[PDB]
Amino acid sequence: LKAWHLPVAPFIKEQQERLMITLWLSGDDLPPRVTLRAEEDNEELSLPMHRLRQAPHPGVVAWRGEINLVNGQPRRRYSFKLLWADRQLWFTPQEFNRFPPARLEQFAVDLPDSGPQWVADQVFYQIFPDRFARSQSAWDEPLTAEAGGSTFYGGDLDGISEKLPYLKQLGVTALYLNPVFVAPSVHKYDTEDYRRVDPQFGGDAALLRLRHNTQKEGMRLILDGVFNHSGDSHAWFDRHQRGSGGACHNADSPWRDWYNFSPEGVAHDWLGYASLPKLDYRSSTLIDEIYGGEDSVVRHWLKAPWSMDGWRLDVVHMLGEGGGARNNLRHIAGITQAAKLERPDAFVFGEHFGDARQWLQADVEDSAMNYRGFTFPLWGFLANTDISYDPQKIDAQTCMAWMDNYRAGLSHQQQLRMFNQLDSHDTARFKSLLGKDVARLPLAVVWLFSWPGVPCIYYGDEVGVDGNNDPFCRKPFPWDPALQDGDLLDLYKRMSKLRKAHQALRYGGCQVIYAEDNVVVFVRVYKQQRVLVAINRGEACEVVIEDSPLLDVNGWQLKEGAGALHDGVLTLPAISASVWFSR
Amino acid sequence: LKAWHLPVAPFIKEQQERLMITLWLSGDDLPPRVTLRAEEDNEELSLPMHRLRQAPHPGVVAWRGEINLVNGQPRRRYSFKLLWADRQLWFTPQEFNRFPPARLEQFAVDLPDSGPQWVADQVFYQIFPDRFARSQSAWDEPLTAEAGGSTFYGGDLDGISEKLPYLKQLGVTALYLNPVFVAPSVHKYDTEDYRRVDPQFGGDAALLRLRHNTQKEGMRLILDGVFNHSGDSHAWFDRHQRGSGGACHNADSPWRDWYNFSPEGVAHDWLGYASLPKLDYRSSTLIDEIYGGEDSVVRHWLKAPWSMDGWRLDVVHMLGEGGGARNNLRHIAGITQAAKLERPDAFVFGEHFGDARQWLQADVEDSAMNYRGFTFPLWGFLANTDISYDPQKIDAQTCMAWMDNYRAGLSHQQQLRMFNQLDSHDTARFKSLLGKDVARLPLAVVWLFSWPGVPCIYYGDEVGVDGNNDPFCRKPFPWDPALQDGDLLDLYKRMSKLRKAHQALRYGGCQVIYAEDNVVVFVRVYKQQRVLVAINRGEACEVVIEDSPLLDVNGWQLKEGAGALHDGVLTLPAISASVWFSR
Ligand SMILES: OC[C@H]1O[C@H](O)[C@H](O)[C@@H](O)[C@@H]1O
Ligand SMILES: OC[C@H]1O[C@H](O)[C@H](O)[C@@H](O)[C@@H]1O
Structure with a gap:
């Protein structure tokens, strides 16, 4: 017995206020009845299917059913219940099932789709601002382990502006920038001021220019949003009493309850880093400042003159109340909701090194950095390693069972906007992870553009930058073409053209x-x-x-x-x- | 290679502020390292495990690790990552996994456990009030299809009070009552007044007595909570203009926005039944009336003098805003939260004919009528049928893969309070569903008391009441012992004693x-x-x-x-x- 269904034309078709669903079967002992299991307002529905007269392909019997679209929530979950005289069999995103599938692992289509529909048409490029390009108004010194991470090489936003022709040649249509707000470090996740761009990157004027230049070149722009914690030099916290009423050293501070201090008086922070005190979202004023208010930080950079296209949410999974992740889902939902109020097509996606399905399945965010669903399957199948750099021996069967199992939790529209990449500023370079198997790198590059999701190049991957984990994955970009893998560069160029050309890749x-x-x-x-x-x-x-x-x-x-x-x-x-x- | 772990002593032990986790392995090629994957504030953690010197059993190597308990959310998720020189293998609730398990399908233990810890010690009995027992202040007429469901046989709450000695003899420690509030039907899901007990069942005075008598006999009491919809004869809606300002016939009604009316003017209702108009939870006054206010309906029956032990939530999955289930999870969470404010150990569980895991996995309710995780596995394995009375041919492998797959989404504490039953007032009697295989009924009864969860007898199951689906599953209870299966009655009695006697069954x-x-x-x-x-x-x-x-x-x-x-x-x-x- 065989079956085929994909949540897309030619298998589905919207017609008036009805979603037509088609299933293909083939074999010697075909079920005389098929029930389309659908859901309206979480109520399971048995909708009957009827056999079509015309065979869509040699030896293939087609069944059709209908989902009424006037009632129900936008996300239409469904699966196929094959019925014989004495037995049943389910057909699902993960092949045949002898017992019912999980509700959240059915096929699913978002009709109507209120998501950011532009994301599927993009090629993304992630830039670590200090390490990408200096504007026209030393760069080859090797990164060390002692100093690398505190050393400014001096890239800025005008440098990015000046390199837009290169990025357009590469096929890029959207930028994801690492943190650019005022902060003491080179990476700047220790936010000191959410309202100002750090002068070291060119300040407010340089980000205004980048927004103009990207707009003019038809390119999207996403900023890194750091809301789980602030910097310890922020006026709200202020470790070093550079102000009068900081939270760290004043019980009467207007922001004392924006942080959690233990009975002994140690602030809760991110994974033990004291320069990153954690924000206590029990406080209703913190909520108003970050996303609830009209000029909260989340909305501020999404309206004019900034008009950014969305937010990458740093450490999205730990944000919450009381020193931990209590009520996390509600707060991420609030952030996303605030963002869409300002710009209905704002793209909000979360950094998830782990399993993001519960967040995505409750729709608290549009997408995730797809480490679990894309990156680590490729690390294991191609580079024999994983998130912990523990050895991995998985074959194609396992690799695809893994990738298809993850997708199964996601609607077709969610799958198409998952943020797929091969590495980032928080991992070793994938080229280095391959070791002796570096000839497999072009395979990953093709896969990155042809698996469902939006691809994101980590700056310098395309010309063959390598290196180990943070700090060594933040090498300066080599603009000397003699230090560039031009063959690899051309592969990225050709793949982005294939994706731009063919609808099925998007x-x-x-x-x-x-x-x-x-x-x-x-x-x-x-x-x-x-x-x-x-x-x-x-x-x-x-x-x-x-x-x-x-x-x-x-x-x-x-x-x-x-x-x-x-x-x-x-x-x-x-x-x-x-x-x-x-x- | 073999492995053993269960989320309970002797495998886990709380000691000071640490959770000790033990894993057992056995085989020829044992991993030289094991990582305990745990989670703190949604962040995955690699905690190292060490091999214990003492073998717990012949040929068994034990590994131990620790979860720090001072930080993190109460629910401790974890799994085991076996590491060799070249490869890894995961051990999970569902045996070995070659790729990482879903975060929400790991082992899990709630420490601290804020749930209703009494539920695991109970034997429940569900009573359809009209069909159970008449008080001392015709009963054998066969139920028909035309009239059955509109015919009052006249059971009442004093009848239940008078039968408490029988229910104690049976082993019962907790009652779940079907709706008892003022309403025109015999079943009374068309609520007319949430504040008064229907006189047909003995009114307020009779429920006061039942609360007293159950209290005095050490028995818990749960009421049926109907909040997705009201009755069309409720003053708020009032189809028949028995009042001045109902919502159905007055645009200026104080409750016009507690319901959704189409552009043509038809109220949204439950699955097409016009006598059950659906409540629009967008309205902030409806929210205050049902669960937000101090004397909202949910809290009203949980404080003195009523002091009920909790709520069964009817159609829990469809409650929401705008005529459908929009924002369902938030509202069920609000109901449960309101209930625990009034009584911290209130038991709140939802009617889920379908897959309840998303509700339970977000902790919006303590438990569910475990149709998906318990009832339908037994219908299929034992009675060759399912929720739609479609034929089913599943063997033991499939039946247990199904039951264990569902449990895997639940913590140990959640598993222990799942509301397991063999049938209800919304299904055919299980005895009838067996047809020629009725000799299998004692098997189900033993299973019902020995599978994790709290068992609930549907009134009359224990003396062999049979019948088809609604209305024929609501037969009058046969108090004539000549019409009673006494052998089956004794089996229930013995099983409840086994469960009362042995901790591992609870x-x-x-x-x-x-x-x-x-x-x-x-x-x-x-x-x-x-x-x-x-x-x-x-x-x-x-x-x-x-x-x-x-x-x-x-x-x-x-x-x-x-x-x-x-x-x-x-x-x-x-x-x-x-x-x-x-x-
Ligand atoms: O958010 C994490 C950031 O701060 C951390 O302490 C890391 O050491 C740094 O490399 C990173 O940029
Ligand atoms: O909640 C459902 C109730 O009303 C429905 O219309 C059914 O017909 C009835 O049997 C049941 O008691």
């Missing part, structure tokens, strides 16, 4: 077709278009692709890599990734 | 030991005590129980059923359930 469903040992093969699917991606992490090999109605096309045009598809046989060279378009 | 962990085809075997585990339960749904058979360190005891004393355990061989008669205690 809007399409995703079906893993083959996942065994060293080879992953999946197809993106949108209307009549198909994009096939074959990844081979090991020696050269041949693989048989079973006749599949998802691949029933006029023909295949190879677009990247040296793989070859003929009569259902994929010939894959050693350590390769290939992409085909259907013609 | 507080213990649960490990499925064998689940193949027709046989399920599991053990409840608490400190040094063990309760072994073997269920055989088919013909008589013998089953080998592998040597297991969970079963390494002084000896086994058979307590119920005719099964026999000797030298690791279970001899199980056809269609039987057996229970042993460790001595």
Whole structure:
């Protein structure tokens, strides 16, 4: 018995106030009835399906049902209940299930979709401001472990402005900046003033120019939002009594209850770092200052003249009351809600090194840095390591069971805006993590642009910057092309063009077709278009692709890599990734 | 490779401000390191484990780690990360995992536990008031389909009071009553007045007496709370203009915005029943009336003189704003929070025919009617049917994968207070659902008292009342012992005594030991005590129980059923359930 469904055309179609759902089956003992299990206002519904007269593909029986759209919440969850005379079988995002699927692991489509619909059309680039580019108004000194992280190399926002032509050439359409607000460090997560841009990066005037220049170049701009904790030099806290009524040293301070102090008097902070005291969101004035008020920090940078496109929320998972994460979900929801009040299409996403599904499944934020659903699966399958740099021996089966299990908790629209990257300012460079297997790096780059989600390049990844974890992953960008991997740069350029060109790489469903040992093969699917991606992490090999109605096309045009598809046989060279378009 | 862990002593121990966690392993290629993955304030933690010198059981290596308890939220989630030189393996509530488990499917223990700790010590009994017993101040007429459901047979609350000796003999310690407030129907979910008890059931005076009599007999009392919708005869709505300013027929009504009326003017209601208009929780006055105010309905019946022990929340999953379930989780949380303000140990649980995990995993309620986690697994494995009375062919493997998958989303303390029952006033009688397989009924009864959770008898189940779905599952209770299955009655009596006697049936962990085809075997585990339960749904058979360190005891004393355990061989008669205690 076989089944196919993806939460996208040609399988679904909105028509008047109805969502038409289509399921494909094939086999010797086909169920005489199929129930479409849908949900309206959390109530499970048994909607009957009827067999269509016309076979969509050779040997394929199609069933159709309908979800009434006038009632219910925007997120439409559903799955398929196959019924024989004596038994039942569920069809789900994770294949067949002998017992009912989790409600939160069904197929799901957001109709109406109130999310930030521009995110799926973007190529993102993350910039650590000090290490990217100096404006026109020493840079090669090697980063050390003692000093690296306290050393300013002097990049600024005008430097970013001046490099916009390079970033457009690369294919970038959106910037995510690390913290830019006034703060004593080079990274600036120890916020001193949420209202002013640090002069070291060019101050307010330079961020105004960057907003203008990105606007003019059609590029989005996201700022790093640090609200779990403040800096210990902030006027609110003020470790060093640079002011009169700080919270650290005055019981009568207007902000004494914006922090939690123990019975002994030690402030609660972030993972033991005393320069990052944690903000106590029990206090209703702190709530008004961060997101509740009309000119709260969250809304301030989203209205004119700043008009930023959204927020990356630092340490999103620990923000809360009383020195810990109590009432975290409510407060992240409040931040996101405040952001959308100011700008309805604001993109709000959270830093989640761990499992973000509970946050995303309650819709408290649009998206997450997809470390669990994308990054660490690739670290393990490709680089034999993981978040703790513990050894990892997982094959294609396991890698794709993992990636597909995570996605299953997410609607199609949520999947398309997940923030996928290979590394960041808080990890070792992926190129370094590969060690002797560095030839696998182009495979990751292709995967990054073809897996559902929006891709984000970590600055310098594209020209082959390497290095170990913080501080060594914050190397200065090498603008000397003699220090640049130009072949790798071109791969990023070509992939962003493939993604810009083909709707299925931005809007399409995703079906893993083959996942065994060293080879992953999946197809993106949108209307009549198909994009096939074959990844081979090991020696050269041949693989048989079973006749599949998802691949029933006029023909295949190879677009990247040296793989070859003929009569259902994929010939894959050693350590390769290939992409085909259907013609 | 083998592993054992249950979220209970002897595997965990609280000591000063530390939670000691112990893992057992056994095999030829044991990991040289084990990391205890724990979580503090949603931040994943790598806590190292150390090998204990003393083997807890033959051939078993024990690892130990610690969770610091002074920081973090009460719910302590954790799992085990086994590390070799080249690879890792996760150990979880659902056995071994090759990729990381879901955060919300780890082991979990609530320390401190602020839940209603009395629930785990209870045996519940659900009474449909009209059909249970008439007070001392016709009953055999068969229920029909035309009239049944509009016919009053005349049971009342004094009848319940008068039958308390019978219920104590049965082993009952807690009552769950169906709606008792003023309303025109026999079932009374069409609430007319939340402040008064319907005279047909004996009025306010009779519920006062029942509260006194249950108090005096050491019994808990839960009322049915109907807050998703009101009755259409309520003064707030008032379909029939029995008052001056109802919402249905007055745009200026003080409660016009407590309901949602379409552009055409049709009120939103429950699943198309016009006598149950849905309450619009966008309105801040409705919120104050139901749970926000000091004398809101939710708190009213929890303080003196009523002092009820909690609330069963009808249609908990659809309550919300705007005619649907928008902001449902916030409002259920508000109801529960209001209840605990009035009585800190109030038991609040929701009617969930579907998957309740998102509600329970956000702690918006203490528990749920465990239809998904308990009832429907038994309907399928034992009676070949399911919630829709669709055929079901699942074996022991599938049945236990299903039951253990659901539990995995729940902490140990949550599992112990899940509201388990075999049927209710909204289902066919389980005895009828068995059809020709009615000999399996005693198996379900044993299972109901030995699976983690609090058991709830549906009135009359214990003497063999049968019947089909609503209205035929609301037969009058047969007080004529000639119409009573006395053998079945005695089984309930003995099981409640086993549960009252043995801590592991109330507080213990649960490990499925064998689940193949027709046989399920599991053990409840608490400190040094063990309760072994073997269920055989088919013909008589013998089953080998592998040597297991969970079963390494002084000896086994058979307590119920005719099964026999000797030298690791279970001899199980056809269609039987057996229970042993460790001595
Ligand atoms: O938010 C974390 C930031 O501060 C931390 O202390 C790290 O050491 C630093 O590298 C990082 O930029
Ligand atoms: O809440 C549901 C109640 O009303 C429904 O209309 C049913 O028909 C009735 O049997 C039940 O008691």
